[PDB]
Amino acid sequence: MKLEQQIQRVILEEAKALIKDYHEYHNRVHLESVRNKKRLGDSAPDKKIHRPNYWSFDKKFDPFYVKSNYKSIARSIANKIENRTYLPNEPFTKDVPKPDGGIRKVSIYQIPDAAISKLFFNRLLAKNRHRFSSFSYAYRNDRNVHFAIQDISVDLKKNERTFLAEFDFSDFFGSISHSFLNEQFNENGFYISPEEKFIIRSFLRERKVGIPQGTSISLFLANLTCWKLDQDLEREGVKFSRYADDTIIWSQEYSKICNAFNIITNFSKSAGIKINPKKSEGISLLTKKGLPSEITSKNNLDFLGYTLSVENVSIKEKSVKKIKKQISYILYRNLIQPLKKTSLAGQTIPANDRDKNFLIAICEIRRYMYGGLSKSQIKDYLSGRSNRLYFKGIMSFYPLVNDVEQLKQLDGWIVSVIYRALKLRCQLLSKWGYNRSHNFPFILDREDIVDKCSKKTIAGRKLFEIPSFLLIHKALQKGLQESGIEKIMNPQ
Amino acid sequence: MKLEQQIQRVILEEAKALIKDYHEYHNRVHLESVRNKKRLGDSAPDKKIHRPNYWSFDKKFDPFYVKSNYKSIARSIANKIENRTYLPNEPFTKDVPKPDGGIRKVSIYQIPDAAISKLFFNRLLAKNRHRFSSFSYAYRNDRNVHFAIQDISVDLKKNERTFLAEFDFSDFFGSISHSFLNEQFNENGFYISPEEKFIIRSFLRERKVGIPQGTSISLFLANLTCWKLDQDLEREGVKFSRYADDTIIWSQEYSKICNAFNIITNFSKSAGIKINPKKSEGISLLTKKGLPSEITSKNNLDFLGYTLSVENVSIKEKSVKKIKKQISYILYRNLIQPLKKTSLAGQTIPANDRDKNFLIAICEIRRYMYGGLSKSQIKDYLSGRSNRLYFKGIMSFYPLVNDVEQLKQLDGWIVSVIYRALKLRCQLLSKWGYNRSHNFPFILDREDIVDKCSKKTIAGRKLFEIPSFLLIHKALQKGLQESGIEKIMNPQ
Amino acid sequence: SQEYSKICNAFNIITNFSKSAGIKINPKKSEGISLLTKKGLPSEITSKNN
RNA sequence: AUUCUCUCAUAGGGAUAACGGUGUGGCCUUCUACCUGUUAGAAAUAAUGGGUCUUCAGUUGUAAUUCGUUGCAACUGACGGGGGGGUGGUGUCAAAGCCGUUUCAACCAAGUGGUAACUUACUUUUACUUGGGUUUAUACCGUGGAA
RNA sequence: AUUCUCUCAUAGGGAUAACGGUGUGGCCUUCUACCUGUUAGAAAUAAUGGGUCUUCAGUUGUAAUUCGUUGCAACUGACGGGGGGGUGGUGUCAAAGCCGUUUCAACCAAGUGGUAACUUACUUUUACUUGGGUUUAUACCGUGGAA
């Protein structure tokens, strides 16, 4: 087919995606407003509906208007791409620096330009994916972080002490030399058509150095420049794994890991990229616990939310603290916050050994960790009674974790936090003039919360059971050997 | 879905494929019989239709009977796979030794067993393709011979002299140790379910050593055993490319290529495979023409139908001789063979400057080399007037050839052979009593055959033009940079 | 030995033999890799005199 | 109008008012061990209502082997953090320590110079919600029309 | 029966005779520079019939640059093997050589001790045929039924 049919179909799909997202967004907002009213009573605020503020800067940002007039835009763009006159329109770049983080300025392009960028990125990736290295895991459709994690986990067990080099790059996207970039189009066996070359050069006219962020065409150019670095790194004879601008190298020889520094420095001098000397760790020796070392040594390393070691693979401390933050905020929101207002008009007071708020908080925690599964369904999957199960929780993002002790400590932390939150709720209810210290669940003790909640039934469903990380860990371990990583892992 | 639906669908597709092939086969036979009658006149033999002789050995070989009764076979097999009682039936192995070739005994299995083998091979390949090396090109759906050819062609240009090691293995499939094979299922991070282990072991019960040939389940086991060999070969720091049991290694260091021999020997001792000392070439130094060498040296090497060198990539001599064989036989069949019979009853004698046999031979040659394209369509593709063209000829099997001189010599050989065949046809027609030495095309000379045939028209189509390899080479070169290798290459 | 790489390879040989024979080394009575020099000479890594 | 047209087609002109989604219910079919109530009615079966179990490592004693690890009874071992105060053991020449009872803390806090708040929130690889499909049953959410 | 059923389901029982494909034509739509005949009829356009062109490297002289390589006239260089005999050049002190005319060979054969045959053929990575789709137009090919 001609280029105009492809532009028309890509533009139509892109336009319909934003409309679907907006239609789901305002319905979620209405449902959450209704539940907030039922929770806060008469103290709930009013519902507010917002629209993107950049939809009014230029008419072409609005997906409804783009969809209404897509055939003419297609026609025009096609003609100007066949007349060598096309030029992307200036983007909207409101991104600004954030505390403790890089500015990370990101540009948002209009729908026709982003559609052209994605269309021309897909064909280049399809034509040239077979000439990339097997140790690059970013911006591709056949590799993912979990493959690098599995490769490092498998390789580190074999030996007892290995050397490691960790280095970082400063301003990766904004420091690529244009004369360098243009010289790689005729090397390593790549296939770039003249029209594709034109389209690529059309996106760099405004700048004098670096490549734009926020667009899909720069993700191929990001992997294009490191082909010689990966070629020389593999020729050296050391193992490595690179994701975007973050890399790690390990080897058994000091001389080999010293030569890897010279290779990295030579590539940085060739491409004009300067390394950051404040976020780099350098050369260190990783050994098992208790073994002495002659040089600077460490026991574990962090890589993309994981904590690799000689023995086990665990979750990073920052991600653990964010899980604790979300669970604690859910309990505080559903138990303590409503009772701190000026008046209790429209609220509901627990009575007759019933508490809807505790059930709601438990259900929300179960939806946050499991995703809605029950312990009976999990045990049916484990016993082989059933042969189908879905993974849609937070644990789906860390399927390679095999550290039981950390999960046990998280379970004990959850139980203690729940007990103390219920104690504070009881004290606040006593302060308001209601005494419910002899009713469920305020009467339960810490040592019997799980056992007593494991029995209470409602409508034939055990809706009061406390989720455990160990059970879902066992289910993930069983499903990994029967379906694979790609199937088990989350789609995002 | 359950296992029975998958078995039912796979069996049905396999059964319908043979029926489609047979229905196309007997129609091709009838058409060829009609044309043979019109060509040989009254001396043509009678049409004969055959059936596979092994269809009567066991009813289950017949696809019509299998299709008629597929649901019961599905049911049964499923039940016995869920009761741990399944066992493949003995195959039919009529393959025998051939002169100048290995016996290569091949077993044909029945449809349900081959369907189970393919079904269980597909899921294993999907679950474990990400743990294979990037330099293995056999029995996969993401790598092909042409990728290895492009990698060697690109790498050899950079340097002027490299060392090479070429070695071969004797009886690869029939010498794998079972105790070795069973020990690799728990290493390198593989994922094999217990049911899959059962199915695998079910196909090796009869033998005491080696794996069966002719089935789809052994193609995964072929790539499974060489994981440690490829791991150590990549750890050494040398380049290589392995396809099935054939491998090549090249490097810049004598010590590195000497260590590659020790790695190969250690792997052969570990797996029990013995190398053949009569089909191996050893260690040689490849240099450019005219440069002296201190050790045994050569100028080019052969790999999978190609002839690689420092400068160019050409076609192997054996494939060139087979192309010449096919062209010469086509000309002999359509020009000389009919006139050597006892009587010319029912034949047609050329007259009034007309010759249907010459036109038929030219059309068959064009279909053999191009596939039916015309020089006007090719020049339209080259000039950019059109933007779509198909490649369905013999040249589609060698798209990376860039040796113009060889194609020019083949063109001159074609012209000379055509001229001499027409001269012999004229002499035979003179011997039968007809003098046509002053009529087209017997009057044309060698130096004007192309120029005169390039003008004659019939029904507005230049059906007498002589095909040239250089034009299709230019079209292949242009299409490679605009669609890619996967798209241009043949589907087989 | 006189070479750091050679004394680093000796560790891999010892570890491979321990894995082959099933013997496990004790990490509390071992001293590791150290450089022995004469008294008064500086060292770049952990050093001892006797 | 987010619906439909028109062409000079990253724009401009007409014509019609509806056009996209969410919750609940329905239907379609879809992977499931038992034991018991009350119904119905022939135990073909249904209909509903209650309760239990599922994992791993062992030690066996044995069958099977296809010469192994297997399948098995029976067995026994696992399987929900940490911190600050008080008070008994038992620790020894002192002691560490090791035992368990009783209190305090919504979380970061096993800490800060000091400790409260927050989810349409906050941010560097950092994000997702419950087998599908179809329902002019049923109630509502953008934006229009009417007013 | 290769069609449909039935269950004890790698099998066995019934019932119906049609069931799968190929060539040609049709239709649907699908990527295409011109110049000319004769038609038709208004040059809106058709309908058919004839003929030419398409690639790469240069040298420019110049415009554009977005500071380059570009786009351009015009230019000139490419673009269909080898072998065995005869005979002229020109080779030089001889000579190699280098020039081109004239004959012989269906291919392997630029070779074998010797050279004919073969495609439903022969064989180690070794194989495929012409944008699709739909046509109870039209003629035929397996296997059934009828006979």
CSV table of C-alpha atoms in Angstrom, one decimal, chain A residues 234-460:
chain,number,residue,atom,x,y,z
A,234,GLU,CA,32.8,-8.6,23.8
A,235,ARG,CA,36.2,-8.9,22.0
A,236,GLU,CA,38.0,-8.2,25.3
A,237,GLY,CA,36.5,-11.4,26.8
A,238,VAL,CA,34.5,-10.1,29.8
A,239,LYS,CA,30.8,-10.4,30.7
A,240,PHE,CA,28.6,-7.3,30.9
A,241,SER,CA,25.0,-6.1,30.7
A,242,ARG,CA,23.9,-2.7,29.5
A,243,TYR,CA,20.4,-1.2,29.9
A,244,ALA,CA,20.0,2.4,28.4
A,245,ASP,CA,23.0,4.4,29.9
A,246,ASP,CA,23.5,2.1,32.9
A,247,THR,CA,26.1,-0.7,32.6
A,248,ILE,CA,27.8,-3.3,34.8
A,249,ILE,CA,30.9,-5.4,34.0
A,250,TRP,CA,32.3,-8.4,35.9
A,251,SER,CA,35.3,-10.7,35.3
A,252,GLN,CA,37.8,-12.9,37.0
A,253,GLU,CA,40.9,-11.0,36.0
A,254,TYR,CA,42.2,-7.7,37.3
A,255,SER,CA,44.0,-6.9,34.1
A,256,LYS,CA,40.8,-7.6,32.0
A,257,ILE,CA,38.7,-5.3,34.3
A,258,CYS,CA,41.5,-2.7,34.1
A,259,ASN,CA,41.4,-2.8,30.3
A,260,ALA,CA,37.6,-2.4,30.3
A,261,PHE,CA,38.2,1.1,31.8
A,262,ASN,CA,40.4,2.0,28.9
A,263,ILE,CA,37.8,0.8,26.4
A,264,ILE,CA,35.1,2.8,28.1
A,265,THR,CA,37.3,5.9,28.2
A,266,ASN,CA,38.3,5.6,24.5
A,267,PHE,CA,34.6,5.2,23.6
A,268,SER,CA,33.7,8.3,25.7
A,269,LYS,CA,36.5,10.3,24.0
A,270,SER,CA,35.3,9.2,20.6
A,271,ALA,CA,31.6,10.0,21.1
A,272,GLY,CA,32.2,13.1,23.2
A,273,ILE,CA,30.3,11.8,26.2
A,274,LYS,CA,31.8,12.6,29.6
A,275,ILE,CA,31.3,10.3,32.6
A,276,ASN,CA,30.1,11.5,36.0
A,277,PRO,CA,32.7,11.0,38.8
A,278,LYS,CA,30.2,11.4,41.6
A,279,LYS,CA,27.7,8.6,40.9
A,280,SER,CA,30.3,6.0,39.9
A,281,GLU,CA,31.5,3.3,42.3
A,282,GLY,CA,34.7,2.1,40.5
A,283,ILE,CA,36.4,-1.2,40.8
A,284,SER,CA,35.6,-3.5,43.7
A,285,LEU,CA,35.9,-7.1,44.6
A,286,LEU,CA,32.7,-9.1,45.5
A,287,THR,CA,33.3,-12.0,47.8
A,288,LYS,CA,31.2,-14.1,50.1
A,289,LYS,CA,30.5,-13.0,53.7
A,290,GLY,CA,33.4,-13.7,56.1
A,291,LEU,CA,36.2,-14.0,53.5
A,292,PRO,CA,39.0,-11.5,53.7
A,293,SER,CA,39.9,-9.2,50.8
A,294,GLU,CA,43.1,-7.5,49.8
A,295,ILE,CA,41.4,-4.5,48.2
A,296,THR,CA,38.1,-2.6,48.6
A,297,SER,CA,35.3,-5.2,48.9
A,298,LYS,CA,31.5,-5.4,49.2
A,299,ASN,CA,28.9,-8.1,49.7
A,300,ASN,CA,26.1,-7.1,47.3
A,301,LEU,CA,25.2,-4.8,44.5
A,302,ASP,CA,22.0,-3.1,43.2
A,303,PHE,CA,20.7,-3.2,39.6
A,304,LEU,CA,17.3,-2.0,38.4
A,305,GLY,CA,15.4,-2.4,41.6
A,306,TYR,CA,17.1,-5.7,42.6
A,307,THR,CA,19.9,-6.6,45.0
A,308,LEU,CA,22.1,-9.3,43.6
A,309,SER,CA,24.5,-11.3,45.7
A,310,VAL,CA,26.5,-14.6,45.6
A,311,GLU,CA,23.6,-16.5,47.2
A,312,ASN,CA,20.2,-14.8,46.9
A,313,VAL,CA,18.3,-12.2,44.9
A,314,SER,CA,16.2,-9.8,47.0
A,315,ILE,CA,14.2,-6.5,46.7
A,316,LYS,CA,15.9,-3.1,47.0
A,317,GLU,CA,15.5,-1.2,50.2
A,318,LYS,CA,13.9,1.8,48.5
A,319,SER,CA,11.2,-0.4,46.9
A,320,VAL,CA,10.6,-2.1,50.3
A,321,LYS,CA,10.2,1.3,51.9
A,322,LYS,CA,7.7,2.4,49.2
A,323,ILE,CA,5.7,-0.8,49.7
A,324,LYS,CA,5.6,0.0,53.4
A,325,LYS,CA,4.6,3.6,52.6
A,326,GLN,CA,1.6,2.5,50.5
A,327,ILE,CA,0.4,-0.1,53.0
A,328,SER,CA,0.7,2.3,55.9
A,329,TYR,CA,-1.1,5.1,54.0
A,330,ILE,CA,-4.0,2.7,53.1
A,331,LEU,CA,-4.5,1.7,56.7
A,332,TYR,CA,-4.2,5.3,57.9
A,333,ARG,CA,-6.7,6.5,55.3
A,334,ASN,CA,-9.3,3.9,56.1
A,335,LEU,CA,-9.0,3.8,59.9
A,336,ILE,CA,-7.6,7.1,61.4
A,337,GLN,CA,-8.2,10.0,59.0
A,338,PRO,CA,-12.0,10.2,59.1
A,339,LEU,CA,-12.0,10.4,62.9
A,340,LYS,CA,-9.8,13.5,63.0
A,341,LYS,CA,-12.3,15.9,61.5
A,342,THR,CA,-14.3,18.6,63.3
A,343,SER,CA,-17.7,16.8,63.2
A,344,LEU,CA,-18.8,13.2,62.6
A,345,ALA,CA,-22.0,14.1,60.7
A,346,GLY,CA,-22.9,11.5,58.0
A,347,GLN,CA,-20.3,8.9,59.2
A,348,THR,CA,-21.0,5.4,60.5
A,349,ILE,CA,-20.1,4.1,64.0
A,350,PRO,CA,-19.2,0.4,64.4
A,351,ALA,CA,-21.7,-1.6,66.4
A,352,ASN,CA,-22.9,-5.1,67.0
A,353,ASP,CA,-19.4,-6.5,66.3
A,354,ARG,CA,-19.4,-5.1,62.7
A,355,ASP,CA,-16.9,-2.8,61.0
A,356,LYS,CA,-17.2,-2.0,57.3
A,357,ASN,CA,-14.1,0.2,57.3
A,358,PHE,CA,-11.8,-2.7,58.4
A,359,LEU,CA,-13.2,-4.9,55.7
A,360,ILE,CA,-12.7,-2.2,53.1
A,361,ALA,CA,-9.1,-1.7,54.2
A,362,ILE,CA,-8.4,-5.4,54.1
A,363,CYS,CA,-9.9,-5.7,50.6
A,364,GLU,CA,-7.8,-2.8,49.4
A,365,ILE,CA,-4.6,-4.4,50.8
A,366,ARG,CA,-5.5,-7.7,49.2
A,367,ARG,CA,-6.1,-5.9,45.9
A,368,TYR,CA,-2.8,-4.1,46.2
A,369,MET,CA,-0.7,-7.2,46.9
A,370,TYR,CA,-2.5,-10.2,45.4
A,371,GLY,CA,-4.8,-8.6,42.9
A,372,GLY,CA,-8.0,-10.3,44.2
A,373,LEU,CA,-6.9,-13.9,44.5
A,374,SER,CA,-7.9,-16.1,47.4
A,375,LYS,CA,-5.8,-18.6,49.4
A,376,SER,CA,-8.1,-21.3,48.2
A,377,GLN,CA,-7.4,-20.5,44.6
A,378,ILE,CA,-3.7,-20.3,45.3
A,379,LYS,CA,-3.7,-23.7,47.1
A,380,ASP,CA,-5.7,-25.2,44.3
A,381,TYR,CA,-3.1,-24.0,41.8
A,382,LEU,CA,-0.3,-25.4,44.1
A,383,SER,CA,-2.0,-28.8,44.5
A,384,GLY,CA,-2.6,-29.2,40.8
A,385,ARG,CA,-6.4,-29.2,41.2
A,386,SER,CA,-6.6,-26.3,38.8
A,387,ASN,CA,-4.2,-25.4,36.0
A,388,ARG,CA,-4.8,-21.6,35.3
A,389,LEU,CA,-4.0,-18.6,37.4
A,390,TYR,CA,-3.3,-14.9,36.8
A,391,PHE,CA,-0.7,-12.6,38.4
A,392,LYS,CA,-1.7,-9.0,38.6
A,393,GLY,CA,-0.2,-7.7,41.8
A,394,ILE,CA,2.9,-5.9,43.0
A,395,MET,CA,4.7,-9.2,43.2
A,396,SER,CA,4.4,-9.5,39.4
A,397,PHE,CA,7.2,-6.8,39.1
A,398,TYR,CA,9.7,-9.0,41.1
A,399,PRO,CA,9.2,-12.6,39.9
A,400,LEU,CA,12.9,-13.6,40.4
A,401,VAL,CA,13.0,-12.9,44.2
A,402,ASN,CA,13.9,-16.0,46.3
A,403,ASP,CA,14.6,-14.4,49.7
A,404,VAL,CA,12.2,-16.0,52.2
A,405,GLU,CA,13.5,-14.2,55.2
A,406,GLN,CA,12.7,-10.7,53.8
A,407,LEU,CA,9.2,-11.8,53.0
A,408,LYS,CA,8.7,-13.2,56.6
A,409,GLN,CA,9.9,-9.9,58.1
A,410,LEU,CA,7.4,-8.1,55.8
A,411,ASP,CA,4.6,-10.3,57.0
A,412,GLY,CA,5.4,-9.7,60.6
A,413,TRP,CA,5.6,-5.9,60.0
A,414,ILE,CA,2.2,-6.0,58.4
A,415,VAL,CA,0.6,-7.8,61.3
A,416,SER,CA,2.2,-5.5,63.9
A,417,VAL,CA,1.1,-2.4,61.9
A,418,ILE,CA,-2.4,-3.6,61.6
A,419,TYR,CA,-2.6,-4.3,65.4
A,420,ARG,CA,-1.3,-0.9,66.3
A,421,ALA,CA,-3.6,0.9,63.9
A,422,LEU,CA,-6.6,-0.9,65.4
A,423,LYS,CA,-5.5,0.1,68.8
A,424,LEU,CA,-5.3,3.8,67.8
A,425,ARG,CA,-8.7,3.5,66.2
A,426,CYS,CA,-10.1,2.1,69.5
A,427,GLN,CA,-8.5,4.9,71.5
A,428,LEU,CA,-10.0,7.6,69.2
A,429,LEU,CA,-13.4,6.0,69.3
A,430,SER,CA,-13.2,6.0,73.1
A,431,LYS,CA,-12.2,9.7,73.0
A,432,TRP,CA,-15.3,10.5,71.0
A,433,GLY,CA,-17.6,8.9,73.7
A,434,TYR,CA,-18.1,5.4,72.3
A,435,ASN,CA,-16.8,2.3,74.2
A,436,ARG,CA,-16.2,-0.6,71.9
A,437,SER,CA,-13.2,-2.3,73.7
A,438,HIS,CA,-15.1,-5.6,74.0
A,439,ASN,CA,-16.2,-6.1,70.4
A,440,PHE,CA,-14.6,-7.5,67.3
A,441,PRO,CA,-12.0,-6.7,66.2
A,442,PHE,CA,-10.8,-4.4,69.0
A,443,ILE,CA,-10.9,-7.4,71.5
A,444,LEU,CA,-8.4,-9.5,69.5
A,445,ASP,CA,-4.8,-9.7,70.6
A,446,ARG,CA,-1.7,-9.7,68.4
A,447,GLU,CA,-1.0,-13.4,68.7
A,448,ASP,CA,-4.5,-14.4,67.6
A,449,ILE,CA,-5.4,-11.9,64.9
A,450,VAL,CA,-4.5,-14.3,62.0
A,451,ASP,CA,-6.1,-17.3,63.6
A,452,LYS,CA,-9.3,-15.5,64.4
A,453,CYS,CA,-9.6,-13.7,61.1
A,454,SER,CA,-9.0,-17.0,59.2
A,455,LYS,CA,-12.4,-18.3,60.4
A,456,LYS,CA,-14.9,-15.5,60.2
A,457,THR,CA,-17.0,-15.9,57.0
A,458,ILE,CA,-19.5,-13.7,55.2
A,459,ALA,CA,-21.8,-14.8,52.4
A,460,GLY,CA,-19.6,-18.0,52.1
